Write a protein that binds this ligand. Sequence first.
Ligand SMILES: Nc1nc2c(ncn2[C@@H]2O[C@H](COP(=O)(O)OP(=O)(O)OP(=O)(O)O)[C@@H](O)[C@H]2O)c(=O)[nH]1
Ligand SMILES: [Mg+2]
Lengths: 172, 906
Amino acid sequence: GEVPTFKLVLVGDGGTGKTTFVKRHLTGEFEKKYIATIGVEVHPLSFYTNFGEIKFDVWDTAGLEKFGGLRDGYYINAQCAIIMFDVTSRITYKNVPNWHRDLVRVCENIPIVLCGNKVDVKERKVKAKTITFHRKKNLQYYDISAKSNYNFEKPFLWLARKLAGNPQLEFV
Amino acid sequence: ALDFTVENVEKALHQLYYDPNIENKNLAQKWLMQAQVSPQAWHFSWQLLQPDKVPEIQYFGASALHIKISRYWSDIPTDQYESLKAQLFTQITRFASGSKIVLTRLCVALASLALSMMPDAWPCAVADMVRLFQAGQGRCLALLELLTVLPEEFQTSRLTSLAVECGAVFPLLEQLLQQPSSPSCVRQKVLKCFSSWVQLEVPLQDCEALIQAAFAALQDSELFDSSVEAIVNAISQPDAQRYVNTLLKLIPLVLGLQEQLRQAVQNGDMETSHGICRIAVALGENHSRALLDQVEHWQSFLALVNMIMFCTGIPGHYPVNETTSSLTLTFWYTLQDDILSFEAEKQAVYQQVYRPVYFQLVDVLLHKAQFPSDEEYGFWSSDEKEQFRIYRVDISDTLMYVYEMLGAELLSNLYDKLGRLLTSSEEPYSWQHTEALLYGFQSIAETIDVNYSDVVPGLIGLIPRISISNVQLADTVMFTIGALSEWLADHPVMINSVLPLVLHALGNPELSVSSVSTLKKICRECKYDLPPYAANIVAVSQDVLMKQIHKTSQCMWLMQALGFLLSALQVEEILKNLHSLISPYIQQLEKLAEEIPNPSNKLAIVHILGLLSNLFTTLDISHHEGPNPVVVVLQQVFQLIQKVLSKWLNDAQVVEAVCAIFEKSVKTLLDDFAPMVPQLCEMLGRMYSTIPQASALDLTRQLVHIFAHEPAHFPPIEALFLLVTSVTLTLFQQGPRDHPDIVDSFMQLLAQALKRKPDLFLCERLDVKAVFQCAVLALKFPEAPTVKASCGFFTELLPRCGEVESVGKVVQEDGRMLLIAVLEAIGGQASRSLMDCFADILFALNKHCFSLLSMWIKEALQPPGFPSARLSPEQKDTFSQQILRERVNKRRVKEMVKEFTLLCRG
Ligand SMILES: Nc1nc2c(ncn2[C@@H]2O[C@H](COP(=O)(O)OP(=O)(O)OP(=O)(O)O)[C@@H](O)[C@H]2O)c(=O)[nH]1
Ligand SMILES: [Mg+2]
């Protein structure tokens, strides 16, 4: 354990891709099924950088209300977060403000990356030009596709750089 | 044996938060979920909130209380309400000194309680919170937290407007804020409380006084961010346009920030310049036209435009020095939309007034989009450059819309500056100033009306005169060329002045994306005038491909570019050229075809396959948008493909590549694929019988779409259709939810059958009952895309009842199941996102089998609390009535389904 481990909380509406994203980073395969998460499932995720090694403990929370578990409670001691939404579902996006509001209530000013998932789907319903989230210094946005592998690493790279205060970080 | 005592919860929390073991964290969290729901939680949580314990521990206690109160209300005996109310108050008063994080959660808790008994049991919640919290600083900050969080929980709770009670909150805020003796902290909390309550249906007119205090608070560093937020939320309200008179009072207030803005820019104070810009842009981008109609106030709106112009032109570069400029773009666009929105008498006056402003904006925008000096740019961070790229995309989009309004003169002005800069004045060389001007042209080059082009020819002539000593400049040149793709098709004589430049850039590895994407554009746009350049283009392409110059993605764009090129050449020339191009790859594939099972081979195999599919995506001699070359190539290649399948059967990625080849070739030649039908069906039929995959169903669906009414070639496809349906049906029994993807393609296939050729359903070899059954269950799947596909099927099925399809109306012996599944979804079993798909099924039931639907629905809603327990028989009847109207249109059925589903959920 020569390097620290940052607590990353993964949040967002049900079926947005949270679990599929994390899973693809961990095994490489893309799950076609949607098996709601119950409470949370913490998964360790490590990346090798040009400066050293960065370790993450991704807290994959549950988007469905009925399976929320300890939502507020998983946020405690987070060094950062990722709020996810479906680009093919206007409702998952209109809800981003509520997820953000609660992360802030527990941790303030931690870096947060907002991802628009499933941009690989031909009929997008939330155009990237509409995103106004990243207008904050500790906030950022990205079009991602857990399926097409598009901008797969971006969120983790941004966060990693913000966390280690070193814009020079690059994954190896 | 661990009971839910404080001691064990603490140990648990410590584990979750500090034990580095992951397995252990997960184990603790599961147990903690149990403890939270247990009724012990009502005893141990107050023990966790003791000064005796650490903050993150105390936190959980308040967290539990908020969850039990907001999500298990029915489990709370009424004899507990008041004593619970009181205990929350007490603890809130106590945590004023302690952790703010816990103080917040406690407030959220008392706020859920409040909202749950507020209409009936707790008549005056807000008024009582105020009275109780008064009789010092801590108490005050507490009440403000409680009052802030309250309206926030109101927006997300499930199960009478709160806005009406705001009339009691505001007086206190005004009182606290206009008093000299209040601390900054109380003031900041008072401005945050205001933002929360404004986010509801509170009329602007009644906020005026707090709007004025917020403005005065801006000059205080401590309260700035809070005011800016409170003010933007006031102005950005959906109902805000209704109160135009107050809008008039807001203009002088925003203008009064001019000096604060200037000073801020001089001092390099980003956060402040950014804050005032947001305020100004909020007024403009929302109430611009209301302000334009009030012509008597034209002088002020003009001053506001100037102010926003000031933020657009802030010195420096967007990402690295000035965040303020980017927020001004959405405004410049709405002003354009507004000006073009009225009759010429008004339009011309304003077009006269604002044309010079948009010319300035273009000058400003072009300077801001200009790259920095090579040295400067070298130290910009990776994220910064990325942000700058996006910012150019945004400016490009706004620049395009400006052209709509300026038009003609814009192109002349730009052409002059560019030509003047290149041939007339020898000034310090700045490829940057040249690139900015060219970039301006590139952003507008697609939207040039086919009327005026005096500028196009001139520009096209200046392009070869430009120095290409910089990658960026070379990329911009290339992009500008491709943007004039359509324009060239009409002026083939100009092609020669650009094609060589583009072909040259094809060899430069650093310009791949731009070069290749432009070649493809030009080939697509001028298929018919490229025949005399075809061989030279083929020559350059082959050379560049031979050398590893482009990445596989760009290589696919090349294959596409080439297809567009060959499609307009005489048959024999298409053959000769095709052979010189693909023969090597086919041979290479043959040598790769007699090899081992390693990935290195795999990569190669996938590459060649994708090259073939991409070329066949683009090559059409029938221009749908002597035999067919493609067909012959396919025939002579088939033996090889089969050899590939035999050795790579288990590989899904390689298989897909083969499927893509035909998927792409079919959409290219629609009738001319006839000769390939029999061979393809055996292949698709064998594939699916061995390893079921969704692309196989999709391919089948394409053949069905094409040859349905072509009896001469359809028979083998009919067999395929039946075979694939027999397998998917067996598969579906076993893994009802294991292959959502296959179910999705399956539903689309069946919907294509009904759409193009319904009589397919009259085949007795196809189990119509089974299909209908699978369809309805599919409706309950978790995967939204599979459910959408299902709704698709029913929408092509129901229109086929009494439409020469006996088997069709026969299955409406099972019709009430469909209605049930639809009402269960609308009840809240399906995502709100899918509502428009289920409304479509309802509409199809009301317009095609109305008699049935009516019996169906009257029965289905009979059981009490069927779709949702939240419903009332009166609400059930109203819905049943509305949906039984015989003339309803999709528009209405969607509106009522949405209204209904909302009542079912909250
Ligand atoms: N088209 C497309 N689909 C995707 C993408 N990412 C995920 N999905 C689909 O969404 C499904 C996975 O949803 P999940 O990630 O398990 O949903 P979830 O986030 O765990 O929902 P919660 O458990 O409530 O948080 C998969 O079956 C994927 O097919 C994507 O990038 N593009
Ligand atoms: Mg999940």
